[PDB]
Ligand binder design. Structure first.
Ligand SMILES: N[C@@]1(C(=O)O)CC[C@H]2[C@H](C(=O)O)[C@H]21
Ligand SMILES: N[C@@]1(C(=O)O)CC[C@H]2[C@H](C(=O)O)[C@H]21
Lengths: 445, 445
């Protein structure tokens, strides 16, 4: 029964895809290093920082209850029952999840116990429906904007006949449906519309690649897809020696885990990811972690063994997370900001209900989740450790539509994602910086 | 009757392709800006510098007699008769020409009057035959080395099945014949061997392109070709939408005049040019020239009118040669070094025959061209305005086999030749710096 239980005056729930979905039958698979472990650690880091902050909840120690979702909504629901068992360890708010289907499933349960929820990565436009997700907010924007951003990229390059591939579920389907409307407003025609996934209703990854090849004019393929699904499509494209210009949503983003080993078939890909700035203090914190000093994370040993491909053959005692094997996951800023958003809402309620103490007074011992959400959580602060670096929610509990545009390249022997553009109400690109095809040495034999 | 006659104690002849060959019938065509005018000016500059040098011929003023070859050996012979009329204005030595056929034709005449000749650009291995060209030397190497350098480039990239195109004449034919032997030593097979040129025996440029397309496996085409011929082949390749990886000799080199307007069909070309270092003092001298202060050059007005596409519509009085419209022609170092080689040989003869004067004594009034060539011209000095920056000739009157390797690219909107390698006995390359194909935005319509 793996979890992180750290005692406090107020406890925050945490949900992270520590492990991937398991193959065939198994619930849990490999460790998700950057979107699982780093994010988990970014929450532990933010809590440690808040617990050292003299201006944010002094006298009110924040504890945690962090669980694995195994990248499955069904597994997340089971785990989320632990957060509500105390109403059937009391929970003040929940941080997570990542996948929109997980956040949706969790929200369906949490709203029944008036528990506020803040996601740091779920971008489904569905989650903006406050009549259904009345206790949900997020430091990230809805995919209404990402879809617009992608249609504007195609319109800019006159990619007027494209194919679409979407992951089944809450993220992919509504994301691509929004993209199809934006594309239609820009006289962009859709050649074929495919859906991928693990369910009984989905066609094969090879059948999807065959559908893309049956429209040879559509060389640009727009993807709104999970990471796990992006890998299976790339593998299928490889098997059929299919060549496409992939234009992918944040599900792919600037993740090297999707392209590693199949760099040639994803060359020249254009990807989006939410506009973020790395938390420098997090880099320091994360690089100091090892299996000998990190006692509070029960998944850290499995993470270490996977990351360094050894057993603790044998793991060298001086293996270290550093700039040679690590880069801050693009959405860490949102994790820290979500924990801080919850803490700021709690601090404000604390100062309103207990003005003559720093402590959790009698008037605030029984938390009013409804008031915490509506009267406090929709607040305003400058990010923790330009001009618009403020943490706030709109009327619908959403973040701002800001994205960075990336191009998958080969710099000088090394494959990476280079930032080539930005989207915030309008599209800005550095067209000269983009590489569209692999620079292969010609053959003459 | 266009020429440059500057009076001196000793006069040096000069031959430069000021104008291109004329089309159809006409002897002279457009002005050759960089290989014609700049080179001519590099000789006038070197003479001005020598005439200011207290350590090199003080007391012996160097004059000039500079003529246009119109890039034709037949025209060069006519002009060269002026240098020998004084034996049928006395000439001490001749600087030039550029094209190997011109230098050969000139040498056939000069050797009859014991007049030493130094070429700054003729690389034919034929000119190394001292039983035939007994008065010829050069600051440049024979193409025995360039051919080796090119075969080593192909061998390095495993380009084992290639086509060849050569300009008819002394440069192309012996250059490619040497390449074919070096390629055969490296198990490189030749698909087709074509020859181009203005003569009655040559097949069409379109017929040559058709021969290259009939061997589709041979994507790499090696060229030993004149500049004028390189342009006609590129135009023919364009008309047939032919795509090839061109590997070209110094005839093409790093000249933008060959690719201007047809950058797309020559993209990713690998070219060689003799290893040279720009003469900084020349840049200053050349950029100061305008049609109002340059009285001694009778072709400068035509040059200016062509370079700026105006009539002196109307040429702006403040038009200037600068870093925005000018780059020192790759072989300027060799022009300056050839003039200096002649001056050093004359200085040494002067100090041997007139030890008690700086002046041209009675003992040196009738120059012994045979002794000047054999006993003095094969000398040794550090270049004028690493460790091996010395000016010398081997036993055969030749320079050292050193080449720079260039790649025709699009940097960031601008098309240019980037140095990507070097050859001096062995091949060294920076493979990561090379671009092989045009980075075109994909089409999806
Ligand atoms: N924006 C996503 C979503 O399901 O809403 C797409 C896939 C997964 C991304 C993540 O964890 O960074 C989250
Ligand atoms: N090396 C050449 C030659 O005919 O020997 C080839 C074409 C022409 C080059 C030049 O003027 O720079 C000279």
């Amino acid at each position: 029964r793996r979890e992180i239980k750290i005692e406090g005056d107020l406890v925050l729930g945490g949900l992270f895809p520590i492990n991937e979905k398991g193959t065939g039958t198994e619930e849990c698979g490999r460790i998700n290093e950057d979107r699982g472990i780093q994010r988990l650690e970014a929450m532990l880091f933010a809590i440690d920082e808040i617990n050292k902050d003299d201006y944010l909840l002094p006298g009110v120690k924040l504890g945690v209850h962090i669980l694995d979702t195994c990248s499955r909504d069904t597994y997340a629901l089971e785990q989320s029952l632990e957060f509500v068992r105390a109403s059937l360890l009391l929970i003040a708010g929940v941080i997570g999840g990542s996948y929109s289907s997980v956040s949706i499933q969790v929200a369906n349960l949490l709203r029944l116990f008036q528990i506020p929820q803040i996601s740091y990565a779920s971008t489904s436009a569905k989650l903006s429906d406050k009549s259904r997700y009345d206790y949900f907010a997020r430091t990230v924007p809805p995919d209404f904007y990402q879809a617009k951003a992608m249609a504007e990229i195609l319109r800019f390059f006159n990619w007027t006949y494209v194919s679409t591939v979407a992951s089944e579920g809450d993220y992919g389907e509504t994301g691509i449906e929004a993209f199809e409307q934006e594309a239609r407003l820009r006289n962009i025609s859709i050649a074929t519309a495919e859906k991928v996934g693990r369910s009984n209703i989905r066609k094969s990854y090879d059948s999807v690649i065959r559908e893309l090849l049956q429209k040879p004019n559509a060389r640009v393929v727009v993807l709104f897809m999970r990471s796990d699904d992006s890998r299976e499509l790339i593998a299928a494209a490889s098997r059929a020696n299919a060549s496409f210009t992939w234009v992918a949503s944040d599900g792919w983003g600037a993740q090297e885990s999707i392209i590693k080993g199949s760099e040639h078939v994803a060359y020249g890909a254009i990807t989006l990811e939410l506009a973020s700035q790395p938390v420098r203090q997090f880099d320091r914190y994360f690089q100091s972690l090892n299996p000998y000093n990190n006692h509070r994370n029960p998944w850290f040993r499995d993470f270490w063994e996977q990351k360094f491909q050894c057993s603790l053959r044998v793991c060298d005692k001086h293996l270290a997370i550093d700039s040679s094997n690590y880069e801050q996951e693009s959405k860490i800023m949102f994790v820290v900001n979500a924990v801080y958003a919850m803490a700021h809402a709690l601090h404000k309620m604390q100062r309103t209900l207990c003005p003559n103490t720093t402590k959790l007074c009698d008037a605030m011992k029984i938390l009013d989740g409804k008031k915490l959400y509506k009267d406090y959580l929709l607040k305003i602060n400058f990010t923790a450790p330009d001009a618009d670096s403020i943490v706030k929610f709109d009327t619908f509990g959403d973040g701002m539509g800001r994205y960075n545009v990336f191009n998958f390249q080969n710099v000088g022997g090394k494959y990476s994602y280079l930032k080539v553009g930005h989207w915030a109400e309008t599209l800005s690109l550095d067209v000269n910086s983009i590489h569209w095809s692999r620079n292969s040495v010609p053959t003459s034999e």
